[PDB]
Amino acid sequence: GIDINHKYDRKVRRTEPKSQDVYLRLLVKLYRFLQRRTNKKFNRIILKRLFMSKINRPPLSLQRIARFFKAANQPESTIVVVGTVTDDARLLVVPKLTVCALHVTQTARERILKAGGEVLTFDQLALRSPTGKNTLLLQGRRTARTACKHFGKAPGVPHSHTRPYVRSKGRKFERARGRRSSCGYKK
Amino acid sequence: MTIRPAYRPKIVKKRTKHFIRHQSDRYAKLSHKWRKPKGIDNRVRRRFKGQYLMPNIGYGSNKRTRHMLPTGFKKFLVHNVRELEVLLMQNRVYCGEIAHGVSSKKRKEIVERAKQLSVRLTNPNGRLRSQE
């Protein structure tokens, strides 16, 4: 007709997960109700974080929680993490806190009940603060996974820095011609 | 006889005559039904000027007269009298078609009960023919 139905007319990002649960749908079939009456941006970022895969809905270890709870002058804010706040040991003292979280491991409840601060889930949260007043939102790292440093190689630069696919460590493994000095060239 | 169903309009369809599968004239190893001829020369694949009108999403019917048989309903498979209890209260909407593994013993039991349930069948009188 014209010419543009060009590209992309195609809003890529996910509408609903490829997952056929009856618990995770129950959050979606609840939290679609609580972002289309209010317009609060805090609910939508809950909704758009109910959708990533197992990886990239980041794992999140407990020492990252604590100094964020020591991001001080907030003694009442409730912790919301869409992920897995597991347990790490070397945080010796543990503070009183109350988290909303998807998945909490058995060794993770056992120290925060030893804290002892009650952890709550999302429908458990949903009774309390749908506005999000005094609520914290913590999302883990995504260069965190070690399998995610294979990017993006063209070695001539000294901005190369990017972990080739090894067979296994030792010697005579991708270390003679190209890397070091004397076998042809330094990268 | 039966009251026609539930807001009966003009069922008016886009293209009606069937769709007959490029070069099915001079091969009777070639069947009747269509296969978009995917090869790089063809005389219909290029949606040319003359040939057997090429299907797509255009030609369909309206999205309220989807599936609508010429008597207002949408057709529906029926097996025994218990599935005619599915057509208890919806009787003014759909119809029934007695599945063709049902004998003339059990089809005596539909045609005398669901008549009083006021549903329509496409086919009574299958094996009726008032003999066994």
Partner: protein, 147 residues
């Protein structure tokens, strides 16, 4: 791969699951470390979740009317349309229409000059209105003398 057969327990059997999967407060017994697993959604009501007296004090919009009304209209064939999207369109008509209307009188009076027939009841009262409109200007001579 479907839930739910009709299952019948016995009393010595039924008092072993507490051993076999411990409680919410403990680990279990007969397996090492198999804890009782978790829920990811710990209240799973929806109807009594919407009861609520803690949610529907913050809801905003019941836009029950749909407000669709999507039909366009013509700006000449609907003379009805003109005043609605645009007042003062009535002004330009009801200015020039009477100017044509007196001009309809202004050419029948030539026929009432040529033949002089009527002027009986079709245009006689149409031209006798100036005698009534004289009184609309006698007040300009008698009621406008207040300033």
């Amino acid at each position: 791969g479907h839930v739910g057969r009709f299952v019948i327990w016995t009393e010595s059997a039924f008092a072993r699951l507490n051993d076999l999967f411990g409680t919410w407060k403990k680990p279990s017994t007969l397996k090492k470390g198999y804890n009782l697993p978790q829920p990811k959604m710990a209240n799973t009501d929806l109807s009594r979740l919407l009861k609520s007296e803690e949610i529907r004090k913050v809801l905003r919009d019941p836009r029950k009317r749909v407000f669709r009304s999507v039909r366009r209209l013509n700006p000449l064939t609907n003379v009805r349309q003109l005043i609605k999207l645009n007042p003062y369109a009535e002004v330009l008509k009801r200015r020039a229409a009477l100017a044509a209307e007196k001009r309809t009188v202004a050419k029948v009076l030539a026929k009432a000059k040529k033949q002089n027939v009527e002027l009986a009841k079709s245009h006689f009262a149409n031209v006798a209105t100036k005698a009534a409109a004289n009184r609309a200007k006698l007040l300009a001579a008698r009621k406008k003398k207040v300033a």
